[PDB]
């Protein structure tokens, strides 16, 4: 019972950006107010939690391109 | 019982952007107010939670292109 | 019982944008007010939750193109 | 029962950015106010938690491109 | 029962940025105020926690590109 | 007798190929026979001769693109 | 008799190939026979001769692209 | 009789190849026979001769790209 | 009779190859036979001769790219 | 009769190869036979001769790139 598996994908891909100018961004929000009340906290096992967050993010990449490639060969029995 | 599997996809793809100018963005919201009250918190197993969030994001990539490619060969029995 | 499987798709695709100018965006909302009251929280297993959110997002990519490609060969028995 | 598995994907990919100028970013939010009250905290097992956060991030990469590639060959029995 | 596994992926990838100028970034938020009250803290096992944080980050890489590659061959029995 | 000659041709040309897959070429001619009889050969001055040849050529370039350019400026008086 | 000659050709040309896969070339001719009979050979001056040849050429370049350029400026008086 | 000659050609050309995979070339000709009969050879001046040849060439360059440039400026009086 | 010759060609050219994999070349010709009969050879002046040859060449360069440049400035009076 | 010749060609050229893998070359010709008969050889002046040769060449350079440059300035009076 011969089994042959050949796995050779070829990727010549290209994720590209060109910008001539990326300027004059202004991020001036007014002041936020967050008031969170939790009487008891009791986290267990796998938990990711954000309580009372005020995030002011300015994210200006000249690129920002991305490429996620996943390869997976699975030979069970 | 011979089995042959050949897996060679070819990808010459291209995700491209061109911009001449990317300017003059203004992000000036008024002040937000969040008030969340939870009497008891009890998270378990796998939980992702956001409570009381005020997120002011300015995201200006010159590109921002993306390419998600997934390959999967599965040989069970 | 010979089995031959040849898997070679060819992709010369192209997801492209051209813009001459991308300017003069203004994002000035009035102030929001969120008031959420939950007497008890009890999350279990796999849960994604957002409670009391005020998100002010300005997303101005010069591109923003995307390409999701999924390949899957499955050989059961 | 001969088994041959050949795994040689070829990747000549390219995630590239070009910007002529990336300037004049201003990040001037108003002052935020976060007030979080939790009567008892009791975290267990694997927990990631953020309580009372005021994050003012300015992230201006000249690039910011990324490439996540995952390869996985799995030979069970 | 001969088993041969050949694992030789080839990667000639390239994550590249070019910027002509990356200047004139101003990060002047107003003063934040965080007040977090937790009556008792009791962390156990694996816990990552942030309580009462005011982070003012200015992150301006001339590049900022990244490449995460993961290879994994698993031969169980 | 003022003579001004400005010779500035501008060339942004582009000779491009994209081939996803180029395979499975078989060049299997039958055997040939060449018989040339002569007695005298008296070549002189500029002679490019070729007598009694049997060529089998498999020429498979990945692009094989050509660009031939020729600029001449001649000036007598 | 002022003579001005300005010779500034500008060349931004581009001869490009992209081949995803270039494989499986078989060059299997049958055996050939060449028989050339002569008595006198009297080559003189510039003679490029080739008598009785049997060439088997497998030429498989990955690009094989060419660019041939020629600039001449001739000036008599 | 003032004579000014300005010879400044500008060359930003580009001869490029990208091959993902270049494999599986078989060059298996049958055996050839070459028989050349002569009596006198009387080559003189400039003769490039080649008598009775049997070439088997497998030429597989990864790029094999060429660029041939030629600049001449000739000035008589 | 003032004569000015300015010879400044500018060359930013680029002859480039990228090959992911270059393998599995087989050069297995059958055996050849060459028989050349002559009586007199009387070569003189400049003769480049080659009599009775049998070449088997496997030429597999990783790039094999060439750039040939030639500048001449000739000035008589 | 003032004569000024300025010869300043500027060369930023680039002859480049990138090969990920270069392997599995087999050069296995059959045995050849060469038989050359003559009686007199009377070479004179400049003769480059080659009689009765049998070459087996495996030439596998990692790059094998070439750049040939030639500058001449000739000045008579």
PDB file of N, CA, C and O in Angstrom, chain J residues 3-35:
ATOM      1  N   UNK J   3      41.314  72.020 -26.900  1.00  0.00           N
ATOM      2  CA  UNK J   3      40.515  70.801 -26.942  1.00  0.00           C
ATOM      3  C   UNK J   3      40.363  70.300 -25.516  1.00  0.00           C
ATOM      4  O   UNK J   3      41.359  70.007 -24.851  1.00  0.00           O
ATOM      5  N   UNK J   4      39.127  70.207 -25.046  1.00  0.00           N
ATOM      6  CA  UNK J   4      38.830  69.666 -23.729  1.00  0.00           C
ATOM      7  C   UNK J   4      37.954  68.439 -23.887  1.00  0.00           C
ATOM      8  O   UNK J   4      36.906  68.502 -24.533  1.00  0.00           O
ATOM      9  N   UNK J   5      38.382  67.329 -23.305  1.00  0.00           N
ATOM     10  CA  UNK J   5      37.609  66.099 -23.315  1.00  0.00           C
ATOM     11  C   UNK J   5      37.425  65.663 -21.875  1.00  0.00           C
ATOM     12  O   UNK J   5      38.407  65.390 -21.176  1.00  0.00           O
ATOM     13  N   UNK J   6      36.180  65.605 -21.429  1.00  0.00           N
ATOM     14  CA  UNK J   6      35.850  65.152 -20.088  1.00  0.00           C
ATOM     15  C   UNK J   6      35.119  63.828 -20.225  1.00  0.00           C
ATOM     16  O   UNK J   6      34.026  63.769 -20.793  1.00  0.00           O
ATOM     17  N   UNK J   7      35.723  62.771 -19.702  1.00  0.00           N
ATOM     18  CA  UNK J   7      35.226  61.407 -19.851  1.00  0.00           C
ATOM     19  C   UNK J   7      34.920  60.899 -18.449  1.00  0.00           C
ATOM     20  O   UNK J   7      35.807  60.375 -17.775  1.00  0.00           O
ATOM     21  N   UNK J   8      33.683  61.062 -17.993  1.00  0.00           N
ATOM     22  CA  UNK J   8      33.276  60.584 -16.670  1.00  0.00           C
ATOM     23  C   UNK J   8      31.960  59.801 -16.699  1.00  0.00           C
ATOM     24  O   UNK J   8      30.935  60.238 -16.166  1.00  0.00           O
ATOM     25  N   UNK J   9      31.970  58.594 -17.263  1.00  0.00           N
ATOM     26  CA  UNK J   9      30.790  57.733 -17.145  1.00  0.00           C
ATOM     27  C   UNK J   9      30.631  57.226 -15.720  1.00  0.00           C
ATOM     28  O   UNK J   9      31.602  56.830 -15.077  1.00  0.00           O
ATOM     29  N   UNK J  10      29.405  57.234 -15.237  1.00  0.00           N
ATOM     30  CA  UNK J  10      29.097  56.828 -13.874  1.00  0.00           C
ATOM     31  C   UNK J  10      28.292  55.542 -13.921  1.00  0.00           C
ATOM     32  O   UNK J  10      27.282  55.452 -14.623  1.00  0.00           O
ATOM     33  N   UNK J  11      28.740  54.538 -13.177  1.00  0.00           N
ATOM     34  CA  UNK J  11      28.199  53.188 -13.285  1.00  0.00           C
ATOM     35  C   UNK J  11      27.786  52.709 -11.897  1.00  0.00           C
ATOM     36  O   UNK J  11      28.639  52.407 -11.064  1.00  0.00           O
ATOM     37  N   UNK J  12      26.482  52.641 -11.652  1.00  0.00           N
ATOM     38  CA  UNK J  12      25.929  52.068 -10.430  1.00  0.00           C
ATOM     39  C   UNK J  12      25.164  50.787 -10.731  1.00  0.00           C
ATOM     40  O   UNK J  12      24.156  50.487 -10.096  1.00  0.00           O
ATOM     41  N   UNK J  13      25.639  50.023 -11.708  1.00  0.00           N
ATOM     42  CA  UNK J  13      24.929  48.846 -12.166  1.00  0.00           C
ATOM     43  C   UNK J  13      24.994  47.735 -11.126  1.00  0.00           C
ATOM     44  O   UNK J  13      25.656  47.841 -10.096  1.00  0.00           O
ATOM     45  N   UNK J  14      24.290  46.647 -11.404  1.00  0.00           N
ATOM     46  CA  UNK J  14      24.052  45.627 -10.397  1.00  0.00           C
ATOM     47  C   UNK J  14      23.652  44.350 -11.110  1.00  0.00           C
ATOM     48  O   UNK J  14      22.606  44.312 -11.759  1.00  0.00           O
ATOM     49  N   UNK J  15      24.481  43.318 -11.014  1.00  0.00           N
ATOM     50  CA  UNK J  15      24.209  42.023 -11.620  1.00  0.00           C
ATOM     51  C   UNK J  15      24.086  41.025 -10.481  1.00  0.00           C
ATOM     52  O   UNK J  15      25.085  40.679  -9.845  1.00  0.00           O
ATOM     53  N   UNK J  16      22.875  40.553 -10.228  1.00  0.00           N
ATOM     54  CA  UNK J  16      22.551  39.911  -8.966  1.00  0.00           C
ATOM     55  C   UNK J  16      21.808  38.612  -9.218  1.00  0.00           C
ATOM     56  O   UNK J  16      21.042  38.500 -10.170  1.00  0.00           O
ATOM     57  N   UNK J  17      22.067  37.623  -8.377  1.00  0.00           N
ATOM     58  CA  UNK J  17      21.338  36.371  -8.370  1.00  0.00           C
ATOM     59  C   UNK J  17      20.933  36.017  -6.952  1.00  0.00           C
ATOM     60  O   UNK J  17      21.637  36.333  -5.992  1.00  0.00           O
ATOM     61  N   UNK J  18      19.792  35.350  -6.827  1.00  0.00           N
ATOM     62  CA  UNK J  18      19.380  34.729  -5.578  1.00  0.00           C
ATOM     63  C   UNK J  18      18.774  33.379  -5.906  1.00  0.00           C
ATOM     64  O   UNK J  18      17.753  33.311  -6.586  1.00  0.00           O
ATOM     65  N   UNK J  19      19.402  32.311  -5.446  1.00  0.00           N
ATOM     66  CA  UNK J  19      18.887  30.969  -5.646  1.00  0.00           C
ATOM     67  C   UNK J  19      18.658  30.328  -4.290  1.00  0.00           C
ATOM     68  O   UNK J  19      19.571  30.267  -3.471  1.00  0.00           O
ATOM     69  N   UNK J  20      17.441  29.878  -4.039  1.00  0.00           N
ATOM     70  CA  UNK J  20      17.174  29.231  -2.776  1.00  0.00           C
ATOM     71  C   UNK J  20      17.834  27.877  -2.666  1.00  0.00           C
ATOM     72  O   UNK J  20      18.484  27.573  -1.669  1.00  0.00           O
ATOM     73  N   UNK J  21      17.690  27.053  -3.688  1.00  0.00           N
ATOM     74  CA  UNK J  21      18.261  25.719  -3.665  1.00  0.00           C
ATOM     75  C   UNK J  21      18.699  25.354  -5.068  1.00  0.00           C
ATOM     76  O   UNK J  21      17.982  25.617  -6.034  1.00  0.00           O
ATOM     77  N   UNK J  22      19.878  24.757  -5.179  1.00  0.00           N
ATOM     78  CA  UNK J  22      20.435  24.376  -6.471  1.00  0.00           C
ATOM     79  C   UNK J  22      21.064  22.995  -6.323  1.00  0.00           C
ATOM     80  O   UNK J  22      22.220  22.870  -5.931  1.00  0.00           O
ATOM     81  N   UNK J  23      20.298  21.959  -6.645  1.00  0.00           N
ATOM     82  CA  UNK J  23      20.718  20.618  -6.308  1.00  0.00           C
ATOM     83  C   UNK J  23      20.337  19.595  -7.350  1.00  0.00           C
ATOM     84  O   UNK J  23      19.743  19.922  -8.370  1.00  0.00           O
ATOM     85  N   UNK J  24      20.731  18.349  -7.084  1.00  0.00           N
ATOM     86  CA  UNK J  24      20.266  17.166  -7.817  1.00  0.00           C
ATOM     87  C   UNK J  24      20.578  17.235  -9.312  1.00  0.00           C
ATOM     88  O   UNK J  24      19.729  16.946 -10.151  1.00  0.00           O
ATOM     89  N   UNK J  25      21.801  17.621  -9.652  1.00  0.00           N
ATOM     90  CA  UNK J  25      22.249  17.647 -11.038  1.00  0.00           C
ATOM     91  C   UNK J  25      22.965  16.337 -11.321  1.00  0.00           C
ATOM     92  O   UNK J  25      23.886  15.958 -10.594  1.00  0.00           O
ATOM     93  N   UNK J  26      22.552  15.642 -12.371  1.00  0.00           N
ATOM     94  CA  UNK J  26      23.191  14.402 -12.780  1.00  0.00           C
ATOM     95  C   UNK J  26      23.687  14.547 -14.206  1.00  0.00           C
ATOM     96  O   UNK J  26      22.911  14.878 -15.105  1.00  0.00           O
ATOM     97  N   UNK J  27      24.973  14.304 -14.404  1.00  0.00           N
ATOM     98  CA  UNK J  27      25.628  14.401 -15.702  1.00  0.00           C
ATOM     99  C   UNK J  27      26.225  13.025 -15.955  1.00  0.00           C
ATOM    100  O   UNK J  27      27.354  12.754 -15.552  1.00  0.00           O
ATOM    101  N   UNK J  28      25.461  12.151 -16.604  1.00  0.00           N
ATOM    102  CA  UNK J  28      25.869  10.766 -16.845  1.00  0.00           C
ATOM    103  C   UNK J  28      25.748  10.421 -18.325  1.00  0.00           C
ATOM    104  O   UNK J  28      24.886   9.629 -18.710  1.00  0.00           O
ATOM    105  N   UNK J  29      26.605  10.979 -19.180  1.00  0.00           N
ATOM    106  CA  UNK J  29      26.571  10.586 -20.589  1.00  0.00           C
ATOM    107  C   UNK J  29      27.138   9.195 -20.794  1.00  0.00           C
ATOM    108  O   UNK J  29      27.888   8.673 -19.968  1.00  0.00           O
ATOM    109  N   UNK J  30      26.761   8.589 -21.910  1.00  0.00           N
ATOM    110  CA  UNK J  30      27.439   7.392 -22.351  1.00  0.00           C
ATOM    111  C   UNK J  30      28.833   7.704 -22.853  1.00  0.00           C
ATOM    112  O   UNK J  30      29.179   8.844 -23.144  1.00  0.00           O
ATOM    113  N   UNK J  31      29.653   6.660 -22.944  1.00  0.00           N
ATOM    114  CA  UNK J  31      31.021   6.856 -23.387  1.00  0.00           C
ATOM    115  C   UNK J  31      31.084   7.189 -24.865  1.00  0.00           C
ATOM    116  O   UNK J  31      30.461   6.531 -25.699  1.00  0.00           O
ATOM    117  N   UNK J  32      31.852   8.221 -25.190  1.00  0.00           N
ATOM    118  CA  UNK J  32      32.017   8.631 -26.567  1.00  0.00           C
ATOM    119  C   UNK J  32      33.320   8.161 -27.179  1.00  0.00           C
ATOM    120  O   UNK J  32      34.229   7.746 -26.462  1.00  0.00           O
ATOM    121  N   UNK J  33      33.414   8.201 -28.506  1.00  0.00           N
ATOM    122  CA  UNK J  33      34.622   7.821 -29.223  1.00  0.00           C
ATOM    123  C   UNK J  33      34.959   8.899 -30.236  1.00  0.00           C
ATOM    124  O   UNK J  33      34.086   9.361 -30.969  1.00  0.00           O
ATOM    125  N   UNK J  34      36.222   9.298 -30.275  1.00  0.00           N
ATOM    126  CA  UNK J  34      36.711  10.267 -31.246  1.00  0.00           C
ATOM    127  C   UNK J  34      37.909   9.654 -31.954  1.00  0.00           C
ATOM    128  O   UNK J  34      38.838   9.173 -31.300  1.00  0.00           O
ATOM    129  N   UNK J  35      37.883   9.668 -33.282  1.00  0.00           N
ATOM    130  CA  UNK J  35      38.978   9.154 -34.099  1.00  0.00           C
ATOM    131  C   UNK J  35      39.306  10.192 -35.160  1.00  0.00           C
ATOM    132  O   UNK J  35      38.481  10.472 -36.029  1.00  0.00           O
TER     133      UNK J  35
END
